[PDB]
Amino acid sequence: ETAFVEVVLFESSPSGDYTTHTTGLTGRFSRAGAMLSAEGEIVQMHPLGLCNNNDEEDLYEYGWVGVVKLEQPELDPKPCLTVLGKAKRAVQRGATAVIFDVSENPEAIDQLNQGSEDPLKRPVVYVKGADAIKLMNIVNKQKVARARIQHL
Amino acid sequence: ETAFVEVVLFESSPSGDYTTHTTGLTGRFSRAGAMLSAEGEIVQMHPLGLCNNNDEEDLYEYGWVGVVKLEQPELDPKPCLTVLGKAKRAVQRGATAVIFDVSENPEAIDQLNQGSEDPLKRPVVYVKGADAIKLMNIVNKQKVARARIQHL
């Protein structure tokens, strides 16, 4: 159930070319989703961005990997969707995978694994710890980055 | 060493739903490349376009899955690069994986395995027979398609 995540970050050269930079992180496949690998360009999502008006413009170019840092649970107490619901909505919107940074809402792990009986066909990964920090520092400062999620 | 390939065609709807069609097929990871999963937008290359230097190198956004249908060897007398060279060049040009349809040149399988001692860090996949046909009939109709290459 360990999720080996590779992030390919593109760093602007002074000539305005870009330089590939690869970083390694580790998370866990949630029992809520497939035990499969996935790869695609990272799109950061705010978690309250995964409540549905069901608009066409919400469908990102098929195959993106969504990165969602969960807020402290006493901040969005009337949440549109469960964390599990948010993962599904991400997949409906074209996500090949979702990574949850569960650092500020570690109870979210349990909330996901309760959906274990009807799992998503796509992987749902959670990160925390330094591994979440590394990913978020890439994502916050990274205009374009690509994630490769490898199972085993 | 079996590569499980899914080719997903996709279409945004005004209704706010992705419509998808997934075709499943089987190929093999060459020893020429990493034994790793990979996923990205499919780009069809004519095998001659994996030749000359640097004009077309950044044509395609990093992360694409190259589909190259080989020609019979005698058609291509003076080959700019070996089939192995062609695979390496695709990866220099951003490819996250390469799929060769080796139907018209099955000696390519042996050529690729010659580079087994110094494999690429990205997977190099081949298909033939009915698997190659399904793949090519989707790729030739020139819509946008994602390929998912699952190692086991």
Numbering used by the authors:
A (entry chain A), B (entry chain B): 54 to 205
Question: Which text from the study accompanies this structure?
Answer:
Rspo (R-spondin, also roof plate-specific spondin) proteins are evolutionarily conserved from fish to humans and have well-documented roles in a broad range of developmental and physiological processes resulting from enhancement of canonical and non-canonical Wnt signalling. ZNRF3/RNF43 specifically targets these Wnt receptors for ubiquitination and turnover, hence reducing Wnt signalling responses. Direct extracellular interaction with Rspo proteins inhibits ZNRF3/RNF43 activity. Here we report a molecular level analysis of the ZNRF3/RNF43 ectodomain structure and its interactions with Rspo proteins.
By using a combination of heavy atom and molecular-replacement-based phasing strategies, we determined multiple crystal structures for Xenopus (x) Rspo2Fu1–Fu2 (highest resolution 2.2 Å), xZNRF3ecto, zebrafish (z) ZNRF3ecto and mouse (m) ZNRF3ecto, (highest resolutions 2.4, 1.6 and 2.0 Å, respectively), plus complexes comprising xZNRF3ecto–xRspo2Fu1–Fu2, mZNRF3ecto–mRspo2Fu1–Fu2, mZNRF3ecto–xRspo2Fu1–Fu2 and xRNF4F3ecto–xRspo2Fu1–Fu2 (at 2.1, 2.8, 2.4 and 2.7 Å, respectively). The ZNRF3ecto crystal structures revealed a distinctive variant of the protease-associated domain topology. Two β-sheets (comprising β2, β1, β7, β3 and β4, β5, β6 strands, respectively) splay apart, accommodating an α-helix (αC) at the open edge; two additional α-helices (αA and αB) pack against the β4, β5 and β6 face of this distorted β-sandwich. A disulphide bridge, conserved across species, links two structurally elaborate loops, β3–β4 and β4–αA. The crystal structures for apo xZNRF3ecto, zZNRF3ecto and mZNRF3ecto showed no major differences in the main chain conformation. Comparisons of ZNRF3ecto structures for proteins crystallized in several different crystal lattices, or for crystals containing multiple copies in the asymmetric unit, consistently highlighted an acidic region (N105-E114; residue numbering is for mouse sequences unless otherwise stated) within the β3–β4 loop, the short αC–β7 loop and the extended β1–β2 hairpin as flexible elements of the fold. All but two of these crystal structures reveal an extensive interface (average interface area 992±109 Å2) formed between two ZNRF3ecto polypeptide chains. The interaction is twofold symmetric; strands β3 and β7 of the ‘subunits’ abut face-to-face at the core of the dimer. The β1–β2 hairpin forms a second interface by reaching out to embrace helix αA and the β3–β4 loop in the opposing subunit. Intriguingly, these structural features interact in a parallel (cis) fashion consistent with ZNRF3 associating as a dimer on the cell surface.
